[PDB]
């Protein structure tokens, strides 16, 4: 009968979901700031943050311009998140850095 409150006591600690924010090589400053405010909000709630960077076409041939962005995000989210994964290579046409709450 009293499973009702047991189920509640289970649910009262949240399951960590993974929120995805997707950048591009040429994401401009103001738009970057919006996405960063998104990530700050996600990590302060205790959610993981699968940050992706999608290359398109011949932007593939300038990988480091992308890598710069992911490095920038890591640095900005340094006193808040910890890098659970950093991309070495372009897998497909993407580079996935998982952050996670401290």
């Amino acid at each position: 009968e009293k499973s009702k409150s047991s189920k509640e006591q289970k649910k009262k600690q949240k399951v960590i979901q993974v929120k995805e924010i997707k950048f591009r090589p040429g994401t401009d400053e103001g738009d970057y700031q919006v996405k960063l405010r998104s990530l700050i909000r996600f990590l302060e709630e205790g959610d993981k943050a699968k940050i992706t960077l999608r290359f398109r076409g011949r932007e593939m041939a300038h990988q480091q311009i992308g890598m710069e962005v992911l490095n920038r995000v890591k640095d900005d989210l340094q006193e808040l998140a910890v890098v659970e994964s950093f991309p070495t290579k372009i897998e497909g046409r993407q580079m996935i850095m998982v952050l996670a709450p401290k």
Binding site: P25, G26, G57, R58, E59, A61, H62, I65
Partner: protein, 70 residues
């Protein structure tokens, strides 16, 4: 009969609206360049990072026409 253009080599720093580009030249001056007509019509895409030939004018050394992408 036209006066001669300085062709200089350079790297695209930013893509601006409407096929305009900041380009750092070899000499180190950052010109605002625009795509050539031939390139526009032949769909040669220019990106941040790309190596480009820039035709320049002595009349204004802040401006140039991107004529080739390597």
């Amino acid at each position: 009969a036209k006066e001669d253009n300085i062709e200089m080599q350079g790297t695209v720093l930013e893509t601006l609206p409407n096929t305009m580009f900041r380009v750092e030249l070899e000499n180190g001056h950052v010109v605002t360049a625009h795509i050539s007509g031939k390139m526009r019509k032949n769909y040669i895409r220019i990106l941040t990072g790309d190596k480009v030939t820039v035709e320049l004018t002595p009349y204004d050394l802040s401006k140039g026409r991107i004529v080739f992408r390597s």
